[PDB]
RNA sequence: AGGACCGAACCGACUAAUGUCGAAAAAUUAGCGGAUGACUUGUGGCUGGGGGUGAAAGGCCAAUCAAACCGGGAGAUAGCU
RNA sequence: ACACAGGUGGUCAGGUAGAGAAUACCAAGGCGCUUGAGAGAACUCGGGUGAAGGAACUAGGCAAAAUGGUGCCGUAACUUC
RNA sequence: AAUUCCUUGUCGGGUAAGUUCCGACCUGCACGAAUGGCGUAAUGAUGGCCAGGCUGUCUCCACCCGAGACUCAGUGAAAU
RNA sequence: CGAUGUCGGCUCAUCACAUCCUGGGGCUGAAGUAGGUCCCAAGGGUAUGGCUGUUCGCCAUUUAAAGUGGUACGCGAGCUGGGUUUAGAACGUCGUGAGACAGUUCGGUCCCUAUCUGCCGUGGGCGCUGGAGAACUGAGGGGGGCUGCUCCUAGUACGAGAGGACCGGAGUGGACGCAUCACUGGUGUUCGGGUUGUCAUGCCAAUGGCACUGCCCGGUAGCUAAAUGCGGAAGAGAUAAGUGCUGAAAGCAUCUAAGCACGAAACUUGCCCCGAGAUGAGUUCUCCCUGACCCUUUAAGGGUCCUGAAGGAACGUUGAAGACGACGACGUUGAUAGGCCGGGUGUGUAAGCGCAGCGAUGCGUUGAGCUAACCGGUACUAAUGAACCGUGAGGCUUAACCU
């Protein structure tokens, strides 16, 4: 609706970089421990992106010490500060959910080099 | 008008003993 | 989402490797355990040299769930497996000396300080 | 599953009171040819709203 | 409860429903007027009128895409050569439904669906 | 105190400075015009009848047109009235804005819930289904027993059975008001409210203070 | 070579669901066993009721079997309804 | 008993893939099964998918799910070898 | 024990928990040697028990695709 | 006995109170926490598994508790068929034997399309009196009523110590219920893509049919939970057990006889929903109709002509409304549906051409092409002028004010 769309538009942020699934991304998130506020870095691979405007979100999978961790970030939430892209995966699928089953040498993807 | 022929057993075989 | 008969991995080094949840504590007719709920478990296979042997019942606390946890801003954290930490049945007191793998911050209840301190991440 | 007493003709008629049909009583007259037809329907000869639509 | 859903089932499976519209779209283009049941005629407006919109601009890709629907080279020829230019200035609404009583066989509400043409 | 009549406009969420996101239902509360004021002398009770929105001139009937013309109020869709609390008064033709919700914190929202049509016992009363295997025959979602035996000889009134579900007015109470926007006529309330988009809602201050 | 193995036709009927005023007076759907043999099948014969036949269940003998069917003794008898 | 989802012996039996008369799609040839049109409730029947858990269901892993082919390597207890 | 009433005999194994199952003892109500006793590889749409995988069996159901159910037109039953 | 299916399990319950928990109290061999016993109290709540056909019971681990009974030892025209209880077979035992055994094992057809009462939903008719369109009052009825843990009080009172309150406040849970789709997800055989076999469009390329949607990978809108909000109250009235104040009978004493106080999740109300068929049929606001002839068994009578308003219905386009009725929006003085334009979303770099390679294939054009139900617009198509129903000032008696 016009009323809703206008309401969400004012809450946007224009500093959202353009990234695609398969791109290695490090997302900086705010962390609060009682009264102190710190920056925590989460680096991984974007395996799915959901575009819905103010409700847009993306999920990042990283291989930790033993098992993988998947985190879903709300793109326009104040918790996320900045998003930076290191690699440009040369995938051709919107959703990289098949990477969950794969591991080791089979979880790597090529470089777009574009 | 005419009696049936098959005349199957209508009663069910389930004795309540 | 941990319920009865669920397999869990062991984050600590108490000698247990796989455990079965046999009861969810904290309420009558409780269905499944959350991120940091106490549960009663039985060890299904452990280290022969460990201090805990097979077929013993003792409490446990969940630290990681496949279903995941929900953050107040809508974010979620998901893991590839379910893990827990062993206990002492009288006082919570994780018996392990070190815990492997990430641990979420939902366990900061002014009590799990030992778990978080030993956690390599968060 | 089956009746214990046969319903009377009175009950039968009472149940059937709602089965009566209703007449259309809404026949419109074509603007040009003046042929009675159902509203929002083409005439038998193929007229609608005056202009011929079937041409057959 | 089908809240906000669209698309009549017409007591057919997906494959049969798709073929039936495919044939009966082709018949309408060929004859420019056909007699069908009202529910069928209404559902056809959503498969035939998009085809005319595609035929507005003639291109190899559009011809191939048009052929993939109706699977008839005669119909594709009929489009892009007559229907296209005829409706060039028409912004949709290429069809017209006219109720024509009830079918004698089973009392199906019948209707004529015909392109806004044949004014010779 | 009196409530207001608004229209549900989808849902959204508000991001706070601390990070937490608050799901909010957007209610469009335009000016509510008082058409009739009731008093104990005539009606035996005190209430104000209000109208909102607009109606087609050719669609409003003559009895309704005269009723609005008497109050000098432009015709609107539907009419609702609220009882007074004895501490406030109103006059015919007065316009009431959403600003009255600026100083409140909890509200009660009433509306017609979405209609599910004829619903079974499993969906309506959360009945437990029977076994899907182990010999079960044509009794997978059936209600089961509905009475005891000869001794009652009947099914008790108020039994839970399949029937119409939804499409009745329901009230969600003690909802936090997140934001009030007078100039744009919006009322953001935390949570979800009954009914689908575009349905009329009644918003009043929470009574369970 | 094989009363050998897997598996269609063919023969049989272990499980489940459907069907029980059924499409059908034992079937259908999905699985299931044997499938060169003590196999299966066409056509034609032989065994007749206290008898036949039976890798034996009181099984089968024209949808009927701890004594088939039809006619007769016969309007058996009924301290029973 | 029916214009009945059953039963009924023999012969011919093509193309592509396939070990194949299996199976899929087709040729020759033959058919759409003698009530239809709508709507798209509960519930029943036949199916598809499913978060986390994985027999906790139940008299019982009933039913479903799963495994499934070819070539190479490898293959235990026991044994009448 | 296809045999056991008392009985869920006693002990051990398996399970967090085993009237079932497996092993051992014999107080064998009422085993027993061709109406055969005890073993036995292979075989079994054979009985019981356990494990891995697998799953809507289940916690707890949700949605979807078809045939009925529902409405309209034609035909038109049955038990009682 | 011309037939009332008899153990368990599942689903669904309902009542009693001889109360398991929560609530209020007396006594205590009641220091406190924790108990014992008795009285009042039925508002709500009142486990999951292993073994066995089992109810029961034993065992394991939870909870505030895992209450006792009635209801054909509730419930098979609601489900199952494990036990028992037909026909097969075997064991032990009894009998010469046929066979038998509340002795034990293996196997073994659970029919019914709902007439009536009842119950859950939803309509038509008439009534309520001139008709019609709305908004309400509220008799009456129903729904809901559960509670753990942590912290403060306070480490206070108590107690030699060990231990550790009452009352009150805050926070956070479990189970249950209502609503919703913003988020996390499921589904999404109507969207996009990959791919195996085969047939076809003359052939290549490109596409379509069929094989469970052929098998798969994602996924819009809707519906939906595992997802997200909200609820259980506070307060008031009259009380139960109980505690009282004053107070005689009975100079005293005494809660009671007169009078006056407190006193529970029970009762009435407060919260939510239905509700004037509440035939006791209610109230308020607004709108519409105020023309003539005759007849008689001159009556709240009948007949004819002209007018038929408010409004309703019907028909059409339809809906986040729906089995059908009903309910809501719209019918050109128009955004009701479809299409169309733009956007969004989803899938993911279309076809064609060019370039590199012997080729499969790759790169450029190109984040392209195609996009269902979504969003904002647009009369392009379809919602026809009319007909139909509904009238013409609305009875008698009495009372009060104008006349």
UniProtKB/Swiss-Prot annotation, chain A:
Could you confirm whether the keyword Metal-binding appears in this record?
no
**GO process annotations (BP):** cytoplasmic translation; ribosomal large subunit assembly
Signals that turn on the gene: Part of the rpsP-rimM-trmD-rplS operon.
Supply one GO molecular-function term: structural constituent of ribosome
Task: List GO terms (cellular component aspect).
Answer: cytoplasm; cytosol; cytosolic large ribosomal subunit
What InterPro entries does UniProt report for this protein, alphabetically? Ribosomal_bL19 (IPR001857), Ribosomal_bL19_CS (IPR018257), Ribosomal_bL19_sf (IPR038657), Translation_prot_SH3-like_sf (IPR008991)
Keywords associated with the record: Ribonucleoprotein, Ribosomal protein, RNA-binding, rRNA-binding
Keyword Metal-binding listed: no
**Which PROSITE patterns does the entry mention?**
RIBOSOMAL_L19
Provide the family line.
Answer: Belongs to the bacterial ribosomal protein bL19 family.
Assembly, per entry: Part of the 50S ribosomal subunit. Contacts L14. Forms two bridges to the 30S subunit in the 70S ribosome, contacting the 16S rRNA. In pre-50S ribosomal subunits interacts with RsfS, which may inhibit association with the 30S subunit.
**What's this protein's function?**
This protein is located at the 30S-50S ribosomal subunit interface and may play a role in the structure and function of the aminoacyl-tRNA binding site.
What name goes with this protein? Large ribosomal subunit protein bL19
Q: Which organism is it from?
A: Escherichia coli (strain K12)
Q: Which gene encodes it?
A: rplS
Swiss-Prot record, chain C:
Query: What does changing residue 117 to A do?
Result: No change in RsfS binding
Q: Is Ribosomal protein tagged as a keyword?
A: yes
- Name the reported effect of residue 97 to A: Reduced RsfS binding
Kindly give the Pfam families that the UniProt entry links to this protein.
Ribosomal_L14
Listed SMART domains: Ribosomal_L14
- TM ranges are none
Look up the record and report any one GO term of the cellular component aspect. cytosol
**Source domain of life:** Bacteria
Q: Which InterPro entries match?
A: Ribosomal_uL14, Ribosomal_uL14_bac-type, Ribosomal_uL14_CS, Ribosomal_uL14_sf
Q: Which UniProt keywords apply?
A: Ribonucleoprotein, Ribosomal protein, RNA-binding, rRNA-binding
From the UniProt annotation, give the residues forming the signal peptide.
none
In alphabetical order, the GO MF annotations are: large ribosomal subunit rRNA binding; structural constituent of ribosome
GO BP terms: namely: cytoplasmic translation
User: What protein family is recorded?
Assistant: Belongs to the universal ribosomal protein uL14 family.
Q: What is said about its interaction partners and assembly?
A: Part of the 50S ribosomal subunit. Forms a cluster with proteins L3 and L19. Forms two bridges to the 30S subunit in the 70S ribosome, contacting the 16S rRNA. In pre-50S ribosomal subunits interacts with RsfS, which may inhibit association with the 30S subunit.
Role played: Binds to 23S rRNA. Forms part of two intersubunit bridges in the 70S ribosome.
Protein name, per record: Large ribosomal subunit protein uL14
Species name:
Escherichia coli (strain K12)
Give the gene that encodes this protein: rplN
Curated annotation (Swiss-Prot), chain E:
At the top level, the lineage of the source is Bacteria
Task: Share what the entry says about its subunit structure, partners included.
Answer: Part of the 50S ribosomal subunit. Contacts protein L32.
Report what the protein is called.
Large ribosomal subunit protein bL17
InterPro entries given in the database record:
Ribosomal_bL17, Ribosomal_bL17_CS, Ribosomal_bL17_sf
List this protein's GO terms for biological process.
cytoplasmic translation; ribosomal large subunit assembly
Lineage of the species this protein comes from: Bacteria, Pseudomonadati, Pseudomonadota, Gammaproteobacteria, Enterobacterales
Organism of this sequence: Escherichia coli (strain K12)
UniProt KW keywords: Ribonucleoprotein, Ribosomal protein
Which molecular-function annotations from GO does this UniProt entry contain?
A: structural constituent of ribosome
- Database matches in PANTHER family: LARGE RIBOSOMAL SUBUNIT PROTEIN BL17M (PTHR14413:SF16), RIBOSOMAL PROTEIN L17 (PTHR14413)
Curated annotation (Swiss-Prot), chain F:
Tell me which SUPFAM superfamilies the record gives: Translation proteins
A single Gene Ontology biological process assigned to it is: ribosomal large subunit assembly
Please report the name of this protein according to its UniProt entry.
Large ribosomal subunit protein uL3
Question: What's a GO cellular component annotated to this UniProt protein?
Answer: cytosolic large ribosomal subunit
Fill in the PTM field for this protein.
Methylated by PrmB.
Query: Which gene codes for it?
Result: rplC
Q: Which family does it belong to?
A: Belongs to the universal ribosomal protein uL3 family.
Name positions with the PTM N6-succinyllysine: 38
PANTHER family with a match to the protein in the record:
50S RIBOSOMAL PROTEIN L3, LARGE RIBOSOMAL SUBUNIT PROTEIN UL3C
* Modified positions (N5-methylglutamine) in chain numbering: 150
Give UniProt keywords alphabetically.
Answer: Methylation, Ribonucleoprotein, Ribosomal protein, RNA-binding, rRNA-binding
InterPro entries, per database record: Ribosomal_uL3 (IPR000597), Ribosomal_uL3_bac/org-type (IPR019927), Ribosomal_uL3_CS (IPR019926), Transl_B-barrel_sf (IPR009000)
